[PDB]
Design a protein around this ligand. Structure first.
Ligand SMILES: O=S(=O)(O)c1cccc2cccc(Nc3ccccc3)c12
Length: 274
């Protein structure tokens, strides 16, 4: 699919940088015709077929195709796409409240944690209902709308690893951040919606304790810990956390993806359900 090849600068003015990655950067921007504000993601294209710099057009198109499908209060949405010889430029919904991750650096109560968690689950329920696996859920990819409120509103961002799961599983090598990837990712096994549910378990553990369940001193140690389900609830961190909260985490951090709670299970779990 080809995108708008007019100069994006004829239609938008850019401002503050919001984020920066290996082959992309996100700038706050303002559309000239409406004064409305967005987040412009500049993705560097591959210059040759066999290079490893830039993002393959297949991977860019996958992200765009998935984003075009999305309309939900807890997931980022796409406004427009432009391109030129060097970049594809996604004009995305503006989220300006910073990362959940940076909000966390400022441990949550269970009520505060579930406040965020419920929005994350609602977002994921929407995605999984559309057979979309995110594959990169972590605190850095949970963004706030306004960070200066009691219960901030969140949007799930970063669909750079997201895949449609048309057969209940995809077999692709889809490798994100060791701390947050499920054992099937570590082991290069077929992957499905279940991988996201593991990531939610890791996020929940961190929300409640400020500690990462599988984090080792090196990436290989972290990955080995994940594959072995090498985690425990440290009393120093969890002594005043309810056993039901621990139960919720325990049913997500399960090696066999078939035995892991699904997104529907997680919404009906007694810790979450009203
Ligand atoms: O996840 S995106 O949907 O692009 C996204 C959407 C909206 C706002 C974003 C702000 C900062 C970083 C992003 N991600 C990002 C990803 C890769 C490189 C640089 C930034 C934001």
């Amino acid at each position: 699919t080809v995108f708008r090849q007019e100069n994006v600068d004829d239609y938008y003015d850019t401002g503050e940088e919001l984020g920066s990655g290996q082959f992309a950067v996100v700038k706050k921007c303002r559309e000239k015709s409406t004064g409305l504000q967005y987040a412009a993601k500049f993705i560097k294209k591959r210059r040759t077929k066999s290079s490893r710099r830039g993002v393959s057009r297949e991977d860019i198109e996958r992200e765009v195709s998935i984003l075009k499908e999305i309309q939900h209060p807890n997931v980022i949405t796409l406004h427009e796409v432009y391109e030129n010889k060097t970049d594809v430029i996604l004009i995305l919904e503006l989220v300006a409240g910073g990362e959940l991750f940076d909000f966390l650096a400022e441990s949550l109560t269970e009520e505060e944690a579930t406040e965020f968690l419920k929005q994350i689950l609602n977002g994921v329920y929407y995605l999984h209902s559309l057979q979309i696996a995110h594959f990169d859920l972590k605190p850095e990819n949970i963004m706030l709308l306004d960070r200066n409120v009691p219960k901030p509103r969140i949007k799930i961002i970063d669909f750079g690893l997201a895949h449609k799961i048309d057969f209940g599983n995809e077999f692709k090598n889809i490798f994100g951040t060791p701390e947050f990837v499920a054992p099937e990712i570590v082991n290069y096994e077929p992957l499905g919606l279940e991988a996201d549910m593991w990531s939610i378990g890791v996020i929940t553990y961190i929300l409640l304790s400020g500690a990462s369940p599988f984090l080792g001193d090196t990436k290989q140690e972290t990955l080995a810990n994940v594959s072995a389900v090498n985690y425990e609830f440290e009393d120093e961190y969890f002594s005043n956390t309810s056993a039901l909260a621990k139960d919720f985490i325990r049913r997500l951090l399960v090696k066999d993806p078939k035995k892991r709670m699904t997104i529907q299970d997680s919404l009906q779990h007694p810790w979450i359900k009203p």
